[PDB]
């Protein structure tokens, strides 16, 4: 077979110039065409079975001729599909996708373009042979021959409708006008009449022949091959139907022929719905006749768009729903069912900046919502009359297009929150922002007016952002859109940067910021604006006063822990971005406010926490102490160092830390959570770096002999923490305080381990020439960790391990002489997560063990349950 040698490997070759040879030689040799025709199809199935000329010449006995080559494949072991895998993969199989999928399909698609030249199509009799052979070739149980036979049939069906429409519009309809000009008036040519009638008869009969072929293939091949068992065959049956429907509209564009799509809309296979929903939007491009299909299957489309098995089908389902809502086939009640899809129950499963699987879904839903927005926008203008004026001149576009947008998102939220269980507002804001991120490109030019809506000095009437609960959602939507505007696309971002930036000062001055729900999104927006996003606008003048307007609210209001209040994270991210600005005007403001807060704390400790007071309300004063002063300085010391003169520290570590036991009896389980020793480790880690900066003065000029006096504050801090830990070690274990007591001890141990690790890092990172500093460090520091605080550390390790085991229900093996009474452990409202806050403590303990600070029995006790608690613990054990 020489034909397959010039077909499977030839890439850049002429397709039409090779068909004329066989078309003209079939009249010469009748048995040489079908032989090499059938062998070519058999080459792709993967077999050495061949058909001889005397076999293919038996046209009447087609079933037996195809069946005698069938046993040569059933009893054959080694066989692979050379065509299918080459189509699916180009770089994998030996055959590439080039010479076996492009020219291969072009050979059957352009097969009838050459038949009209040599007059072999109408002669006819050569056409019936293929209809006889391929009909019986495409009804077998083996999955090899059926696919290629049905595909060869559909490839000719592709060009059938093409040439039908071509002859209908460029031949018959064109000769009709010539025949119309040869009637009027009183002048028949007669010579040309008998030519016109013959040509028109040919054009009308060729269409009947083509329609007969089409009806044959639709009757015996299409009806039986859309219920097939294979997914690829069933999908290829529907793929090429789009061509026939797009081309020939007389015998295809009907209601009885569009029922197969609504049929296979809910198919058992997965790859069928994909092609179905990819083809469906092409039908609505053309447009009573088609409306009757959607009017009946739109509920099925809703089912597929919402609760489908596969995730890649809903995308194209909503793509169809896009044009559905465009043409108005969808009712107002059915829009709310798809609008709430912007709030899927999955919270951040993949990613956002990389445009993952969760991105395309929300993008398609926003594309759908845009059409509904525009529909209601254009429909509301004609129903109600427009007043002459508004704010300034006439804002006919954005005002109406945003005013209705407020109802849309809130109703979409309520429709999905009425069904699912109630969640807190913190879980609502995140989902609303995840949704509003993708709405940025669709309200990119109108958002200019949204800012002016927040300064509601002007008014407008409504026939038939006011209150605070509405302005909250207003701000959250706007500032979610702001953050989402930076990731997708280009050019649509810098315009908004230049437009919306200056109004931030007016936003702060107009809307009061007493509650934190007002402060959350306003400062969430500020994060996505850097130096280039503020200098290129020409409004770096207002940033100076913006920082002060934020500082006033930071100083006035009280800020609690991050577990209860949200202002903690807000101001933390704010200060971090302001520090990453790196501008000297901004640092001095925060430093001055640090000094002011330090003076306020000093005067607070002088009389409020004075040890000469008879007030037994430590529970009421400790909360105020940690909210008004301590947490603020702990947040500010993140990026702006804080220093404390030893007088304030010795009036603090005396009146507070060395006084906690005689206060703990009044403490409840909510005040104890607020207490965190993250500030006493800040004071050390800043005086442990301000001296590493002095080591950088060896290569300069101009020690002061304060090395003994230098370690005094840090030594006092570590000694007070050790004393507090050992004093909390002796406490009554009643059920009321057994949680707060252990939480306090855990926090103290965490801060102490941080301080000890930092000091032992500083001592080892020193060069060998600095001996007079090693002497002072080994003289002024008698103990880094007292041996009783080590027992307390072991107690906390135990406690956390036993809570982990109580959660995982696995018994713990430990030494005999031990407080085994704490194996059944109480409920704990301090530790929201017990897997993380336990492995963190384990990591800290292992880091201490590496520095030869803890004994070896400690290492033996720590690694006793390396097999019970999974591989994460053995990772710490070995590595």
């Amino acid at each position: 077979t020489e034909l397959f040698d010039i077909l499977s490997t030839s890439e850049d070759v002429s397709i039409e110039e090779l068909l004329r040879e066989w078309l003209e030689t079939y009249s010469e040799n009748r048995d040489k065409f079908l032989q090499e025709f059938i062998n070519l199809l058999l080459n792709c199935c993967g077999s050495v079975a061949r058909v001889e000329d005397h076999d293919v010449h038996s046209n009447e006995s087609s079933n037996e001729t195809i069946g005698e080559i069938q046993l040569l494949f059933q009893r054959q072991k080694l066989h692979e599909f050379y065509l299918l895998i080459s189509k699916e993969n180009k770089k994998r199989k030996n055959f590439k996708m080039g010479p076996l999928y492009q020219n291969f399909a072009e050979f059957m698609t352009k097969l009838l373009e050459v038949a009209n030249d040599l007059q072999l199509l109408y002669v006819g009799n050569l056409v019936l042979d293929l209809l006889t052979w391929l009909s019986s070739f495409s009804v077998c149980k083996i999955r090899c021959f059926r696919y290629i036979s049905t595909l060869t049939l559909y490839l000719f069906q592709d060009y059938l409708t093409q040439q039908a429409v071509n002859l209908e519009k460029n031949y018959l309809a064109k000769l009709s006008k010539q025949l119309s000009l040869e009637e009027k008036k009183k002048r028949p040519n007669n010579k040309t009449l008998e030519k016109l009638e013959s040509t028109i008869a040919e054009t009308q009969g060729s269409k009947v022949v083509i329609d007969s072929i089409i009806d044959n293939i639709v009757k015996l091949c299409f009806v039986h091959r859309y219920k097939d068992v294979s997914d690829l065959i069933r999908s290829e049956s529907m793929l090429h139907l789009s061509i026939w429907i797009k081309n020939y509209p007389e015998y295809f564009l009907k209601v009885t022929f569009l029922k197969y799509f609504g049929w296979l809309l809910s198919d058992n296979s997965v790859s069928v719905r994909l092609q179905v929903t990819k083809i469906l939007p092409h039908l609505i491009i053309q447009n009573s006749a088609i409306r009757q299909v959607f009017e009946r299957f739109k509920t099925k489309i809703l089912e597929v768009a919402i609760r489908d098995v596969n995730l890649d089908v809903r995308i194209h389902s909503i793509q169809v729903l896009t044009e559905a809502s465009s043409l108005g086939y969808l009712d107002d009640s059915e829009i709310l069912i798809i609008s709430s899809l912007m709030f899927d129950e999955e919270f951040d499963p993949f990613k956002t900046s990389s445009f993952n699987k969760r991105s395309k879904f929300l993008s398609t839903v926003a594309k759908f919502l845009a059409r509904v927005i525009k529909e209601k926008f254009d429909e509301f203008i004609k129903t109600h009359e427009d007043l002459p004026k508004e704010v300034d001149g006439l804002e006919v576009g954005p005002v109406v297009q945003v005013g209705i947008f407020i109802k849309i998102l809130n109703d979409s939220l309520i429709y999905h929150l009425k069904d699912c269980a109630e969640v807190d507002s913190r879980t609502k804001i995140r989902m609303l922002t995840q949704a509003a991120e993708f709405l940025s490109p669709y309200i990119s030019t109108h958002l200019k007016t949204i800012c002016n809506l927040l300064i509601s000095d002007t008014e407008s009437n409504e026939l038939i952002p006011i209150d605070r609960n509405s302005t909250i959602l207003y701000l959250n939507v706007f500032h979610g859109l702001c953050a989402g505007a930076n990731n997708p696309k280009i050019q649509t971002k810098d315009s908004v940067k230049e437009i919306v930036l200056p109004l931030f000062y007016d936003l702060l001055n107009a809307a009061s910021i007493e509650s934190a729900d007002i402060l959350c999104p306003l400062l969430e927006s500020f994060i996505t604006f850097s130096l280039d996003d503020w200098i290129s606008i020409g409004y770096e003048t207002e940033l100076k006063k913006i920082t002060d307007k934020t500082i006033k609210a930071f100083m006035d209001s009280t800020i609690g822990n991050s577990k209860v209040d949200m202002k903690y994270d807000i101001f933390a991210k704010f200060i971090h971005h302001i520090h990453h600005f790196e501008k000297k005007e901004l640092q001095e403001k925060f430093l001055n406010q640090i000094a002011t807060l330090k003076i306020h704390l000093k005067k607070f400790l002088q009389e409020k926490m004075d040890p000469n007071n008879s007030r037994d309300d430590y529970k009421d004063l400790t909360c105020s102490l940690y909210e008004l002063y301590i947490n603020k300085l702990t947040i500010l010391g993140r990026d702006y160092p804080i220093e404390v003169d030893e007088e304030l520290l010795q009036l603090f570590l005396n009146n507070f830390v060395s006084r906690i036991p005689i206060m703990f009896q009044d403490f409840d389980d909510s005040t104890a959570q607020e207490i965190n020793f993250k500030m006493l480790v800040l004071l050390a880690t800043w005086n442990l770096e301000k001296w590493r900066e002095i080591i950088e003065k060896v290569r300069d000029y101009e020690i002061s002999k304060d090395l003994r006096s230098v370690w005094k504050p840090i030594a006092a801090i570590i000694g007070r923490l050790n004393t507090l830990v050992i004093s909390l070690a002796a406490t009554n274990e009643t059920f009321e305080n057994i949680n707060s007591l252990f939480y306090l001890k855990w926090s103290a141990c965490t801060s102490l381990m941080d301080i000890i690790v930092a000091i032992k890092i500083f001592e080892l990172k020193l060069p060998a020439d600095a001996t007079t500093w090693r002497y002072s460090m080994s003289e002024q520091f008698p103990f880094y960790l007292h041996d009783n605080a080590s027992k307390v550390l072991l107690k906390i390790f135990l406690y956390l391990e036993s809570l982990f085991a109580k959660q995982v229900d696995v018994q713990l093996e430990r030494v005999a002489d031990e407080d085994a009474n704490l194996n059944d452990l109480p409920e704990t409202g301090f530790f929201e997560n017990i897997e993380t806050e336990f492995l963190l403590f384990t990591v800290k303990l292992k880091g201490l063990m590496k520095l030869n600070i803890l004994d070896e029995r400690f290492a033996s006790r720590v690694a006793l349950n390396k097999e019970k608690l999974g591989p994460l613990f053995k990772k710490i054990v070995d590595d």
Binding site: G637, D639, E689, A758, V843, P871, L872
Partner: peptide, 30 residues
């Protein structure tokens, strides 16, 4: 999914343990 959390451990530790950018890059051993 609950037992196998190897990559999450680094992120959780580096988040919960650190609250200052400058001292952490010099007081956190390798």
């Amino acid at each position: 999914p609950t037992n196998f959390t190897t990559k999450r451990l680094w992120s959780e530790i580096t988040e919960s343990m650190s609250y200052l950018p400058d001292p952490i890059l010099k007081n956190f051993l390798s």
